[PDB]
Design a protein around this ligand. Structure first.
Ligand SMILES: COc1ccccc1C(N)=O
Ligand SMILES: COc1ccccc1C(N)=O
Lengths: 300, 237
């Protein structure tokens, strides 16, 4: 179990850690989060009490270094940093635990939710979508634009998701126009899976990361990426059977975890009605269709 | 974006543009089978591709053999249309290619856009106008070349005959759409109007009769009466 200590909490803020969250009052004696499960990526995220504008946060993996949070009063935000001196870090953390100044990552033992939302997400791939190579952790916020959004404006601050365009020369083989537009298997299997992602695990990893950025930061560009990756699979007549079964599980846990009150903005009615009821895979997502129908029957 | 009554004069500016109408690409005769079921029999069709400024009509005849062994013909017809328009554009010299293609039905947008990915600078546009180009098969000489074709064929016409010698393209298009609207609302009456007087003939190299300016005013008035009338006989007013 690992720890992300905080220097202090000078401003009132709601802090999230994965799917959990808690309020910290201005100058409350808070010094971080302990008992963070090893083996998963994690996200620690922030919403200031005085400006709900800009949710922001940091993707990290404690196996990759010792990380802490420190408020910067010049830039006005809680910043993640790496401590290179391992003995200094251990000594700081141990003092904070002895004084019981940390919240415990509150994982229920039955609960596989975080695993199920991050199964294919790896820090190395996050760091290629979020380019800032001098840090081992990655910053994301509500306003960051994707490369595809920048094509339709700061490139260093972009989310480099894989471009998905259904009316593009990449998607459509000369002479197979109708075939490739109405059945996207070529684009899914040859162009994206074999060509760009190499395997379905990397595809699912980006899909899961896009969903989590949409949910936790309200990142609109990530929402489009998530809906597009889903639609590319559902609009393919030919999909490996293991991929369909895994997609059903992935989406099930995403829909299960989604705040009931964010469904209106985070779920695209056209994509979901198409995927569940018209697409080639309309009958291949049993778990996802059942939870969608019982939780969000309005959308459909 | 969409073409409507507000940007109507744009059709007659000097940017090359084509209208594409696909309503006569897939045509069927519905009939009973010996067993008492219903079947369709396809007949030859055509793509109606028209330069509204010059009157040049690229009539691609769609022979029934193109449907043999194919499924979902209604959907295939839109992609066949788009494939043929794309092939037409590619066959034209660069300086003759259109800058805009306006489709008369919204379901042609994606098929044409996908077939024209190679031409990012050609705008594919819908229209809010209800244009009567379906009635093109009521022009006898066009109907005749379509129904006689034994193979795929492209035939080139000027749908304005020699009118541009005397009138502008705005006026020629207005005349064309009035004639076609009339033929679409009451084909028998419209055709009676156009040919009643045996002394006015259609030149071999034309589609419509050789009306004088004065006779066109008479003709045009008789077509508006027809359209208003039928609108009476239809709605009872
Ligand atoms: C991922 O899809 C997109 C990306 C950028 C902008 C728009 C879209 C979209 N769904 O149309
Ligand atoms: C008779 O042609 C059809 C039949 C069914 C549906 C559509 C069409 C058509 N031409 O688009």
């Amino acid at each position: 179990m690992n720890t992300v200590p905080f220097t202090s909490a000078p401003i009132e803020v709601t802090i999230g850690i994965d799917q959990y969250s808690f309020n910290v009052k201005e100058n409350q004696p808070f010094h971080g989060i302990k008992d963070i499960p090893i083996g998963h990526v994690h996200v620690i995220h922030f919403q200031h009490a005085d400006n709900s504008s800009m949710r922001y946060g940091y993707w990290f993996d404690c196996r990759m270094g010792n990380f802490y949070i420190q408020y910067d009063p010049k830039d006005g935000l809680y910043k993640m940093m790496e401590e290179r001196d391992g003995a200094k870090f251990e000594n700081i953390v141990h003092n904070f635990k002895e004084r019981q100044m940390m919240v415990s990552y509150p994982k229920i033992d039955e609960d596989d939710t975080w695993y199920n939302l991050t199964e294919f997400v790896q820090m190395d791939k996050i760091r290629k979508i979020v380019r800032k190579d001098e840090n081992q952790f990655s910053y994301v916020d509500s306003s960051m634009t994707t490369v595809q959004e920048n094509e339709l404006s700061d490139p260093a601050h972009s989310l480099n998701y894989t471009v998905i365009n259904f009316k593009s020369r990449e998607a459509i083989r000369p002479g197979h126009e109708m075939e490739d537009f109405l059945d996207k298997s070529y684009y899914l299997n040859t162009v994206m899976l074999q060509g760009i992602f190499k395997n379905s695990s990397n595809y699912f990893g980006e899909l899961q990361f896009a969903f989590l950025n949409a949910m936790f930061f309200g990142n609109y560009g990530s929402s489009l990426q998530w809906h597009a990756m889903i639609e590319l699979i559902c609009s393919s007549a030919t999909v490996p059977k293991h991929m369909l079964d895994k997609l059903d599980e992935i989406l099930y846990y995403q829909i299960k975890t989604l705040p009931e009150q964010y469904s209106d903005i985070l779920l695209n009615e056209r994509v979901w009605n198409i995927c569940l009821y018209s697409s080639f895979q309309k009958n291949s997502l049993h778990n996802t269709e059942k939870i969608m129908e019982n939780k969000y029957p309005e959308l459909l | 974006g969409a073409m409507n009554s507000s940007n109507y004069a744009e059709l007659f500016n000097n940017d090359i543009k084509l209208f594409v109408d696909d309503t006569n690409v897939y045509r069927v005769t519905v009939h009973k089978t010996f067993e008492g079921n219903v079947a369709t029999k396809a007949i030859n069709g055509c793509i109606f591709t028209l330069n509204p400024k010059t009157g040049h009509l690229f009539l691609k005849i769609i022979h029934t053999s193109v449907w043999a062994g194919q499924k979902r013909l209604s959907q295939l017809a839109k992609w066949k249309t788009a494939e043929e328009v794309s092939a037409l554009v590619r066959s034209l010299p660069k300086e003759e290619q259109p800058k805009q293609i306006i489709v008369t039905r919204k379901a042609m947008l994606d098929p044409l856009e996908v077939h024209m990915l190679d031409f990012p600078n050609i705008a594919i546009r819908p229209t809010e106008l209800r244009l009567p180009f379906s009635a093109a098969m009521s022009i006898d000489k066009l109907s005749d070349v379509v129904m006689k074709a034994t193979e795929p064929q492209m035939v080139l016409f000027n749908i304005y005959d020699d009118w541009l010698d005397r009138i502008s393209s705005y006026t020629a298009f207005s005349r064309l759409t009035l004639l076609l609207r009339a033929l679409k609302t009451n084909e028998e009456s419209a055709k009676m109007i156009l040919l009643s007087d045996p002394t006015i003939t259609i030149k071999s190299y034309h589609l419509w009769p050789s009306f004088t300016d004065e006779q066109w005013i008479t003709i045009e008035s008789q077509m508006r009466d027809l359209i208003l009338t039928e609108y009476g006989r239809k709605y009872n007013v």
